[PDB]
Amino acid sequence: HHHMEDGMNTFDLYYWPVPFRGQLIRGILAHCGCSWDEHDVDAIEGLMDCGAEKQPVAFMGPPVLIDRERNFAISQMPAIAIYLGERLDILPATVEGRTLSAKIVNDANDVLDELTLNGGREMWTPEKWQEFVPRLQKWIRIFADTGARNGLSAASGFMLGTEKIGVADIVTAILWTTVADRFPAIKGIIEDTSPIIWGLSRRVVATAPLAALNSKSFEEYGNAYCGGEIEKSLRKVAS
Amino acid sequence: HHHMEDGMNTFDLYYWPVPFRGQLIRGILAHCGCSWDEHDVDAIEGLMDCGAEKQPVAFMGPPVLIDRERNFAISQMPAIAIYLGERLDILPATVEGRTLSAKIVNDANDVLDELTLNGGREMWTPEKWQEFVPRLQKWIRIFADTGARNGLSAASGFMLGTEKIGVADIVTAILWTTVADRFPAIKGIIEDTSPIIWGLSRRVVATAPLAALNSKSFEEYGNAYCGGEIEKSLRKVAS
Numbered sequence: 001h002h003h004m005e006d007g008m009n010t011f012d013l014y015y016w017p018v019p020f021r022g023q024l025i026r027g028i029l030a031h032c033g034c035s036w037d038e039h040d041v042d043a044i045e046g047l048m049d050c051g052a053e054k055q056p057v058a059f060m061g062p063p064v065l066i067d068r069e070r071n072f073a074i075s076q077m078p079a080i081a082i083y084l085g086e087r088l089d090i091l092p093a094t095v096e097g098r099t100l101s102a103k104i105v106n107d108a109n110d111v112l113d114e115l116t117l118n119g120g121r122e123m124w125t126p127e128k129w130q131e132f133v134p135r136l137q138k139w140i141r142i143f144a145d146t147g148a149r150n151g152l153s154a155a156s157g158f159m160l161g162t163e164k165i166g167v168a169d170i171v172t173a174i175l176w177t178t179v180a181d182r183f184p185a186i187k188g189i190i191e192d193t194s195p196i197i198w199g200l201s202r203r204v205v206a207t208a209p210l211a212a213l214n215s216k217s218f219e220e221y222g223n224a225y226c227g228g229e230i231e232k233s234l235r236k237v238a239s
Numbered sequence: 240h241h242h243m244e245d246g247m248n249t250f251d252l253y254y255w256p257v258p259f260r261g262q263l264i265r266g267i268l269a270h271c272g273c274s275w276d277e278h279d280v281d282a283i284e285g286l287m288d289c290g291a292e293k294q295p296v297a298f299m300g301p302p303v304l305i306d307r308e309r310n311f312a313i314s315q316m317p318a319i320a321i322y323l324g325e326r327l328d329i330l331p332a333t334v335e336g337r338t339l340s341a342k343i344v345n346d347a348n349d350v351l352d353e354l355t356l357n358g359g360r361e362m363w364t365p366e367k368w369q370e371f372v373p374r375l376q377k378w379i380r381i382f383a384d385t386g387a388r389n390g391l392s393a394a395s396g397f398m399l400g401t402e403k404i405g406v407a408d409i410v411t412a413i414l415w416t417t418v419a420d421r422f423p424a425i426k427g428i429i430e431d432t433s434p435i436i437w438g439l440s441r442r443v444v445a446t447a448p449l450a451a452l453n454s455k456s457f458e459e460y461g462n463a464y465c466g467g468e469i470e471k472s473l474r475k476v477a478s
Contacts, residue, residue, distance in 0.1 A: 052377075052380045052381055052383070052384035053384060053387075055384075057339075057342070057385070058380070058381040058382075058384035058385055059342075059381065060346070060349070060377065060378065060381060070335070072335050072338075074338055074339070074342060075342060076341065076342045076345035076346065078317060078341065078345055079338055079339075079341035079342040079345055082338070082341060083334070083338045083341075086334055087334070095322070095325055095326070096309070096311050099311075099313055099318055099321070099322045100296075100313070100318075102315065102317065102318035102321060102322075102341070103296070103298075103313060103314060103315045103318040106315035106317055106318055106345075106348075107299070107315065109345075110299070113357075118352075118357045122361065138291075138299065139299065141291045141297070142291055142297040142298065142299060143297075144291070145291035145292060145294075145297035146296070146297055148292075
């Protein structure tokens with residue numbers, strides 16, 4: 001229930017119609033009960049190609065978020081997540097807690113890149129995948145460990161030991177659940193490696209706003225994850 | 240002139256002995272007149288391999304920074320940079336300015352990865368390099384544009400239009416100068432693409448603390464940039 005005095009959405013988001021890097025931002029917006037505009041592929045490619053001076057903020061790739069209330073534009077998913085966390089009051093009250101939240105979002109940003117071999121010409125093979133599994137397990141344990149130092153269990157608690165869901169929880173939950181729900185090998189690795197991260201992620205996305213976002217994303221995007229050709233190769237190795 | 244009451248350095252930094260991703264953090268520390276401990280390759284590999292629960296904070300790759308005064312550990316270079324910016328009072332006073340500073344550090348983190356083909360098995364060829372040049376030019380212009388909206392010129396001003404050097408300036412200056420000084424093709428691209436980013440970067444690293452860090456890094460690391468085999472292949476294409 002927050003829009004402008006002419007009824008326009010407070011936020012304007014540019015990100016591809018796949019539940020990938022910008023899904024983490026859509027999750028933060030949805031959790032906090034925000035409404036936002038989206039754009040199609042042609043509009044997103046246009047924004048990338050119009051020249052630095054004509055962009056809302058100079059950026060390389062999406063997501064890009066415009067905050068119409070503050071007349072402010074931001075790119076880089078980790079910068080957008082922490083910005084929204086401050087703006088929407090879902091970060092911890094300490095510099096330490098805010099800083100760990102930045103660490104966790106950057107870690108998430110990194111896992112997304114490693115899952116997709118940095119979105120370039122490199123494809124998965126069964127061999128690259130088997131090499132990667134232990135590293136993916138290590139990433140899962142990096143998340144599980146920060147939770148564990150803050151009292152996290154499968155059944156209760158949040159990532160940074162807070163009273164409520166914060167950015168850290170949202171980004172963690174959307175990262176792991178989105179890929180789990182689409183690639184059975186990865187789902188099995190998460191379940192086998194960290195029950196505590198499984199439980200936290202599944203509790204967070206069971207909340208009404210995120211359960212509704214998850215369903216709406218399936219109905220809009222089908223089974224897409226990233227996708228392009230890189231998705232096809234991940235499907236071959238991680239199903 | 241800030242250490243602990245027993246004289247130990249306030250900060251403890253783990254990063255490889257190359258002027259690469261952690262150089263941006265060394266720059267922030269040096270600019271603010273801080274002293275910090277460093278570690279050798281065996282110690283860094285040890286910290287990576289000791290298990291999540293035994294790390295100062297769970298992390299994948301360095302840099303890792305321990306703040307002994309606050310008893311706080313942080314990884315992810317963009318999270319460390321912004322943490323230090325707050326701790327050492329060299330960030331803008333607005334959420335917008337802090338957030339753009341996060342964007343710029345993430346952009347820097349990304350340029351470092353693209354220069355080194357994500358630190359994996361992929362090597363440069365002359366062909367991949369020619370394809371990359373326009374993208375590198377685009378990155379340079381992304382930095383130049385944010386400067387330009389804040390009044391930046393070659394000869395004066397800072398990235399975010401501030402009274403003094405902030406994180407954004409330091410990370411920008413160290414990113415571009417370090418690679419320029421080691422790869423003549425890249426130096427020529429920066430000079431030809433954005434005189435304003437050239438001038439800002441060269442003004443910032445002319446300051447006494449950063450001029451001393453630059454020299455100390457050459458004497459400790461030789462001509463190394465990243466290096467490993469990926470450095471050898473970059474040298475072949477970008478000299």
